[PDB]
Design a binder for this molecule. Sequence first.
Ligand code: 0WR
Length: 840
Amino acid sequence: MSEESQAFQRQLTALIGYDVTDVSNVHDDELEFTRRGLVTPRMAEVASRDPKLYAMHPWVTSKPLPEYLWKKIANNCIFIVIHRSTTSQTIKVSPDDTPGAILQSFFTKMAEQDFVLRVCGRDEYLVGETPIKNFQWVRHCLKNGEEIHVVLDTPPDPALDEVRKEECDRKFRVKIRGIDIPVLPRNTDLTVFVEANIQHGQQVLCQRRTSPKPFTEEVLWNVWLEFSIKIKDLPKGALLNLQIYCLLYYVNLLLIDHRFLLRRGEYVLHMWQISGFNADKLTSATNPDKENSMSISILLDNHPIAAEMPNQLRKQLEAIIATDPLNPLTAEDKELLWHFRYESLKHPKAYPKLFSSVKWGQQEIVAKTYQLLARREVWDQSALDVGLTMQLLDCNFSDENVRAIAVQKLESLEDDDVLHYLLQLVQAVKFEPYHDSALARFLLKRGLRNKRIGHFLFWFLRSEIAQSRHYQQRFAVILEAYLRGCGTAMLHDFTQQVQVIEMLQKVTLDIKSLSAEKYDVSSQVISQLKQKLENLQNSQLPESFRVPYDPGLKAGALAIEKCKVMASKKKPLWLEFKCADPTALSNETIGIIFKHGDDLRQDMLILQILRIMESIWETESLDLCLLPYGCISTGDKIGMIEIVKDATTIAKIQQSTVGNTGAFKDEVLNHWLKEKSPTEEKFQAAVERFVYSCAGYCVATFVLGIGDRHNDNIMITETGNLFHIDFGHERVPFVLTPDFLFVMGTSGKKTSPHFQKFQDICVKAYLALRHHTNLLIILFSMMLMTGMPQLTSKEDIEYIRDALTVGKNEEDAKKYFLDQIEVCRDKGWTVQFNWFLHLV
Ligand SMILES: CN(C)c1nc2ccccc2n1-c1nc(N2CCOCC2)c2nc(CN3CCC(C(C)(C)O)CC3)n(C)c2n1
């Protein structure tokens, strides 16, 4: 290859954080096959993208303006402040006017046609034929009561986005030779056997075990395990799952490879150890630590191509379909869906149940299933249902044709909605049997098609590549595919970002292992901090970089005087940058907190579900005033977090008035709000914001089953906006403490106008969510699988069914939630006080 060609690939590696030309852990060529296979989709999308629009990446939505944002326009007139040449002028614009038309009524109001409208201080643009009201930035301004400020400048040059050119009827059987681990303690004596499963979509087709034996550094069987199922009957994407029990180790092996070939030969598989069920148990990858890991040795020696329902049965069938996603299917249930297959096809909500009713261990039956998909008319014409689509992409479906129809239905998503679900789609890639998938190809295209999506795709993929041995190989290949298509402008941006984040990660760890647990910091700890940051500033760190959680904002130089270390346990950095954009309205800095560590992946998963819950309320015209702060995971137990300005912790508001207890005063919160309000009109508005945002997080947390939290984890702004934080960690349903209630004008057993408004808001919010029950359930279950440790599929998930009061009616549901509120009144400060004792 060329001298430049190798330096480029070395640049890719630095961005990816994994070398995809490095073949150290693989038993086949699938990863290299997939690199080639992604070239066409990549190239297809680069070719179809408009250079101008790709360069300006307008952030837009086809959804209608909510009632709460219509009420903020009372004259049918929106005001845009344009800035040019040190002179600024307000202008009256109609909500239906396009950017090109308002620019028209600009040059008119004077008494050359190549200027674009950019937001001041941000990398946002208003352009294309869209109504100004359909621009996100505009809607964001109307919601927070912000004036819309826009500067007139030159469109960014599409030249900068340029892309470099490309250069048997036999029963299946497996011999278990044995298992070898380099070392073991002595011991104590225990017993070990091997369990071989044939798995397709977590359904077990066949199972065979070995005879238990004494656990020693090498254990031999050399026995053939003959299964019932025939070689010809193996479905594509079926896993041979090998597990050792005493459950200690597991490893997976794809039985049919990426070329449709049956797997054959000797295999020495290095397995994964269980930590003293989860998407990591599905992985076809083998443990990269080849020296210290348990391994299993097996042998494979053994090609594909190439009447109306009666009424009472119809009701049982419909009852099946009505149930939630995670309700289990009996055998009779399954046989009903399968026999009545043609009826089931007329009910898009039955697709997940019907496809779990397929016997995938039988080739004739799989064959029928494909014929069934052949007439897709009803599925193709149906309204897009995201939660339904999401069910076909989870761990219960390994068939590429089933999964592909889900992806077909994704194709109709506007960028706005792809952002909403991006994180969850990226995680779903883990459930893909093969590295090259319709879903993987769909993430590629959407990312290549739009810079905002592309930006987040990059960080989502990079997070997993950095902390996951299970999926990093497959993600790294998809990221490389993305990077070769995004343009050199974006390659440059990413390169600037990565250099900064890694340097600051180095520092984050270097301070953390200069410090202990308060006690505590410490002038010395803060001196070493500034010292290290001084060495980076000069020299050398990048002049500027995009903020990974807010790609609109460009960060400038550190402000080293305001940087510091946080008094907490984990000793996170508090960093502040100047904004690099000189057209920015204010002088405010950009705060960022670097933390090691909790798991910031759990925070990302929750914040995303939180933004989903918001959009659900937006369709019903509800505004619960949530605050999903930017949070990105960088590496194992490490990442960045957006600093929310003028915000404090509820705990810190109690210890200002009181000290290092623990003795919680009811009036404190309300005094803090009043003290922090410049006028009384802003304090009333703040009490209003706190009623909605409190109602918002009570309902949201109760459903996600995270409702029981310490006051250190809750925050509030000076404008009254309450928000939960740190999601990577007697009882209570959620947190409504006497101090929250006091702000609502309630001391226990007393109702008030603000507290009645609260209950009313909670119920409306809660009942709106219940209409989305399937969606929330699938999202929730996916989060557990992809984001938490090994959990119980059966009991942990079940919480949210109770939380969402499945099967009940809006009357019982309204009662149920109201009771929960009462439970919080009766507990008062008791759970809170106990949390304080558990961290003392
Ligand atoms: C462990 N802590 C640091 C933490 N983990 C988090 C995980 C996810 C999200 C947030 C997490 N925080 C977190 N995130 C804070 N963010 C500031 C407001 O946006 C959001 C970020 C935060 N803030 C305080 C208290 N805080 C009081 C005011 C102080 C100052 C006067 C300089 O403004 C500065 C220090 N704690 C204890 C905080 N923990």
